[PDB]
Write a protein that binds this ligand. Structure first.
Ligand code: AGS
Ligand code: AGS
Ligand code: AGS
Ligand code: K
Ligand code: K
Ligand code: K
Ligand code: MG
Ligand code: MG
Ligand code: MG
Lengths: 525, 525, 525
């Protein structure tokens, strides 16, 4: 269709207008005094929310060029969401502040490529400096503290997460399930988690976690690409009869076969979800086998001349529960016998002795850790169904934050970390004056989150910013009580991982828009 | 003609909009970093100015209700200008701050009369307090200091003003004239100043001072009202022949006769200006006579059966110079002989002995002081015509500030004095909640001048206001260097009188607008 | 009338667009390859010109705000023009370049007052540095050279100007008149020049020089202000009878009397021109007397009780010729006898011995030099009336440039001097970053004149600018021949005084525009 094409400044003003509608809608919800945003729904009451990502999803604009700007900067929240699971609003605030000053510098005649280089240099140094401020979260006391804080001061949840991490290691797999009664339970089951997510968003049966959850499912382990539905028919009907759901772990599920699984789990017919097998090449087969051993299944590979047509319910593996994210599959309580599994471990453990290369060694150690480690299962107890679904959600969130904390530690919240970082970089310089302006654009942007939190309180950003900057270390502003003090002592912490992601994705998308010269869109027609 | 009529809120929003355009245009010029305002002129290059009064005179708005709010608030500046001859921009900023928050309170349902009452109570107490803060300017050291500081640190100008005040008293008449050569000259001549201005603005031959200036003019002293030009004709033509200008001092110059004088000095035909005779009733005649004795003229009064037709050049008085303002006439160097004047002084001095009432005594003492006081003439020396017109202007301005200082003392400049006054009134309460709101409106408005000074620097008004409020006394912000310090030691002082006037005029017009319910104007038609 | 009022950015974009129309019209005519501009006239053929001033005078714009920006910047050309008499196009190109980048720096958020401070600092340093580069023009060889070059390589004209300067000194008075025949004549007559111009442009009888020229006039020397025509009547009629013109040298000629002289020399009735008397105060009377002595006239002062009514043709002085500019009066060949004049000289020369102050000494030496120095008269010979008016024009222009060269010397033309000065200032810094951007603005603008000369040639500005920047000293681009070389050896010189004026008036009006926050004009109605 015929296009509308815009260049330079014409395009920049449209982009900036769109980013501003998006960011301005989102940013009112930042921090403890965030304001509500009302989102219209086609039936019944509108949604009232303080959640950045809910607002951003609804933003689409009529002017097509403004719309492109909103959708580009929206990619900042979702990327920060996917990498750290928090900080999408902080990321949008940082993005609008960089884009705004960046595009003003461009309109003033400064070189967009230098501006970007300066932003990137500041970001690179800011991130090193964030790591140097990060306070580690390594012992179970620290873990329990963070978990307590993330669970709205519920010391129970903190103890639980610390206990789970103590059983499987802070890098171990932990899930949470509904409790059976009043008290919390923590057990370790045979299980495993690997880095593959669902092959279509449609398999998601729980939009609240954006996840796929299956109970007592059969697991098809196919060592090949599935293109034809034909191959599946006999196994699918056999599973239909036992009344259980099916997890397909294949080398891949492509077009035709996937499209059918999507349409057929959509009409309730059979509950099937498909993920890619972990790894690639040689180690892929070995790993498929690890899963087989764990779930008591049998790898159906074309190398031994086995067909999917000639596969019964006995070939399929089984587990009590499987959960799959955008990019994770976790298999909880596999049927595989302790004999077979422990025997498999001993095999791999010997491969480690015969390994003639570090690379092969690490790859093997990873397999053993997954196979011998199992999965911690937190079962959340409560008095009623309602209190339970609620406590479960708190445990899930608290776990998520604590995990982030364990990885890269914690830094002062309320946007003080980025403010301290920016002041350590006052002397940072680049190769020329435009790069220097770029550096300053990014240092200035780093105050935006603190300023917006203050603004949402009804206080003066410039006064609070200036006061915070005039102290040091963990001194900042507690926006819930409206007092200054030590952020760590007050329990206002951000996982370093979230702060670092929000900054990095903000600067990344911003540097793409600051170096955009031309925009192409359909004619409004 | 048909009227448009608005009430309540509809009226309030129009008034506020009008005030805002006027105040916004004027306030950019405030203080050392005031910005330029460009004023269009129908011929040649526009006027570029940093002077509030120049801006304010040009403002007139299309919408007739908005225009009414601009013109009501302009009354602030012009009355502060008439009373204290400085501070009109400060006055305009205080007025906008009061009006803005007062009208918001009204829109919120608070009682306008209580708001006004609260504002008024605050202003009353603020003015007592500004007198307590005020530092006297009474001795000739102080007067030289203030003069020096108002002359851009020119100690020469400070010495001259102190010398002139030492000759004629700090309440005596002082003028400045062009020097004859390189050095300054101070002499005392016979002369007098009285509280009557021109009878039409059209006599103004020097729009730069808004004044009327006449050189070696004849002075007609007529003890009656002049309605007919007929009477004047014979005296007017006799004056026309001598080639000198004429000052008419009559009991009044009404309609017909005035209209003619206006038209005839307009076409350059004869240079004539008219003022009312000073005082009223009995003392008016005796005062007319004092002027006569001073200028060597003869009172033409109808009580002795004298006509204006039978008056020659010999009857008229004379002086080297007369200057007339909106509400002052000053006669410089009258021809009257020292014998006659000194003899008249002695007469009045005896009347003071015979006086049987305080009131008659004081009135008589006033006359003697004027007749015996003379007029100090400062002649400004310089190397070139350009340097002299410049140094003359500095002396004029310094003289004007010093006079104000001598009446009411001096306080910290840079808006600090009103901030110190506000903070002392934090506990001030009225009869009810609305009145308390009124008080707060006024105390908040008292910050506005410091804030606007700061904003014109390009700095952050809330940060500086916060810092200055955290200090005390004379601590404040020097907007020329951008440093904090002691306002007095840094030489940044305002005459108390100008601070007081700005505030009282601002509050006065703001209270009228806040209690306005209805506006009537012509239909745009 | 009702006003339109604009603020900030809305004002800045209007200003800028009006400056661009004006400067774009003017700048095409810069340099040896300047292009033609066609100016409509209401009757007959349009005017075709390469003269910037001519273009500027016609520029008026419909949008009242853009018109204000044109009229402001036109003040640059006319102030350069009054101070130096050349360089107005250069000055307009410098202003456009400073305003353009200065308003873009404001739009980007930079503090206008700091921007202006930076520009002023660069200009102040640039001017010092121009002085350091200036090659003197002090001996008569250099004077002849510069004369020759300013006269389109006419060595004749150069010799003449050098001979005239040799007779009366390089600071002496020199005029040019029509020759009587074929050869040039140079003689020295009794005469004098003083710093007072005409009191109205209407006395101009020669619009080609914008000058007033009077032949064998009477000279009224009145030591007082003339307000009334009455006083003049008897002297005016006495002059009317002798059939000669009259020059009025009074303390001033104000409103009424001036308006009449304007109207009466306008209808051909009597040829009268009026100028202020030189100096002020005491030395004014002494100086009035010097003129009297020179012209054989008699001072009519009111201090000795003399009237203008009682003045005959015998009281008036006389001279063969007088010429009056916007700000100069020159009296050529006064009738005064050598006895009286030489005797007056001896008097003053004694005052110099008795002088007890340097100031009084210099003032006296100035009077002797004027009275004893006379006036060099260049009479231009030619073969026909046409060739003579033409040669006379060349001599006038050459003289004017040579005089400018003698005061402050000469620098490389072609915009090279400013480019050399800009590169010496690369390290110049101010108090903050916005001041530094200011400095850069001004250094970038200093390339504009060379780049616009180049652009007028149809060559590439950046290539030429870069090549000139890469050499040094007087290396530049000869835009007549399109070759690089040594600008001084090629004879492409600018008087330092014109380059300095152009740059200072440009920066001065540009700094006012940059710090303009608000504009007020009549509603288009
Ligand atoms: N008492 C507090 N005082 C100041 N800041 C706080 C306080 N409590 C939490 N915060 C800060 O609030 C910010 C988090 O606000 P949120 O509203 O969750 O937005 P976000 O995490 O940036 O984006 P979402 O949640 O993905 S939408 C973090 O910087 C916290 O440090
Ligand atoms: N260095 C300074 N720092 C802060 N304030 C100053 C400084 N110098 C003068 N001022 C203040 O600036 C204010 C005077 O500003 P102006 O521009 O004259 O306007 P104004 O008197 O209120 O109104 P005008 O002159 O009639 S228009 C006073 O409050 C001074 O004390
Ligand atoms: N051959 C040349 N090559 C380069 N520049 C030259 C040459 N001859 C003269 N110029 C320069 O041209 C500039 C002057 O051009 P003009 O057109 O007179 O403009 P202006 O003097 O800037 O403005 P006017 O005359 O008052 S309109 C000076 O910079 C001269 O040095
Ligand atoms: K939120
Ligand atoms: K001002
Ligand atoms: K030209
Ligand atoms: Mg969050
Ligand atoms: Mg003032
Ligand atoms: Mg020229």
């Amino acid at each position: 269709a015929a296009k509308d094409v815009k260049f330079g400044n014409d395009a920049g003003v449209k982009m900036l207008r769109g980013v501003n509608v998006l960011a301005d809608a989102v940013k009112v919800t930042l921090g403890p005094k965030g304001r509500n945003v009302v989102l219209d729904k086609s039936f019944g009451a509108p949604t009232i929310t303080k959640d950045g990502v809910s607002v951003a999803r609804e933003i689409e604009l009529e002017d097509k060029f403004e719309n492109m700007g909103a959708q580009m900067v929206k990619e900042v929240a979702s990327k920060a969401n996917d990498a750290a699971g928090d900080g999408t609003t902080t990321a949008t605030v940082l993005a609008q502040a960089i884009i705004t000053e960046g595009l003003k510098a461009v309109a003033a005649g400064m070189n967009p490529m230098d501006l970007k280089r300066g932003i990137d240099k500041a970001v690179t140094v800011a991130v090193e400096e964030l790591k140097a401020l990060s306070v580690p979260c390594s012992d179970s006391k620290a873990i329990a503290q963070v978990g307590t804080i993330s669970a709205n001061s519920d010391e129970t949840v903190g103890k639980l997460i610390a206990e789970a991490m103590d059983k499987v290691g802070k890098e171990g797999v932990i899930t949470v399930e509904d409790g059976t009664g009043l008290q919390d339970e923590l057990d370790v089951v045979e299980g495993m988690q690997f880095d593959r997510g669902y092959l279509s968003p449609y398999f998601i049966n729980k939009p609240e976690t954006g996840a796929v959850e299956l109970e007592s499912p059969f697991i098809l382990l196919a060592d090949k690409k599935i293109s034809n539905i034909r191959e599946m028919l006999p196994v699918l009907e056999a599973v239909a009869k036992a009344g259980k759901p099916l997890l397909i772990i294949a080398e891949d599920v492509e077009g035709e076969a996937l499209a059918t699984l999507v349409v057929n789990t959509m009409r309730g017919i059979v509950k099937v979800a498909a993920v890619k097998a972990p790894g690639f090449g040689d180690r892929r087969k070995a790993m498929l086998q690890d899963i087989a051993t764990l779930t008591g299944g049998t790898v159906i590979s074309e190398e031994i001349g086995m067909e999917l047509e000639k596969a019964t319910l006995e070939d399929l593996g089984q587990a009590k529960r499987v959960v799959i994210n955008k990019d994770t599959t976790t298999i909880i309580d596999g049927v595989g016998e302790e004999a077979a599994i422990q025997g498999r471990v001993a095999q791999i453990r010997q491969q480690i002795e015969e390994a003639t290369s570090d690379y092969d060694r690490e790859k093997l150690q990873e397999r053993v850790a997954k196979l011998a480690g199992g999965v911690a299962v937190i079962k959340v107890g409560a008095a009623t169904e309602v209190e339970m679904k609620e406590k479960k959600a708190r445990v899930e969130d608290a776990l998520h934050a604590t995990r982030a904390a364990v990885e890269e530690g914690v830094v002062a919240g309320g946007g003080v970390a980025l403010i301290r970082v920016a002041s350590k970089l006052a002397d940072l310089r680049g190769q020329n004056e435009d790069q220097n302006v770029g550096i300053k654009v990014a240092l200035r942007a780093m105050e935006a989150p603190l300023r917006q939190i203050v603004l949402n309180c009804g206080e003066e950003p410039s006064v609070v910013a200036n006061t915070v900057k005039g102290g040091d270390g963990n001194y900042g502003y507690n926006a819930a009580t409206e007092e200054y003090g030590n952020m760590i002592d007050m329990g206002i912490l951000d996982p370093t991982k979230v702060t670092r992601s929000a900054l990095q994705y903000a600067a990344s998308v911003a540097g793409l828009m600051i170096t955009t010269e031309c925009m192409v869109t359909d004619l409004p027609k």
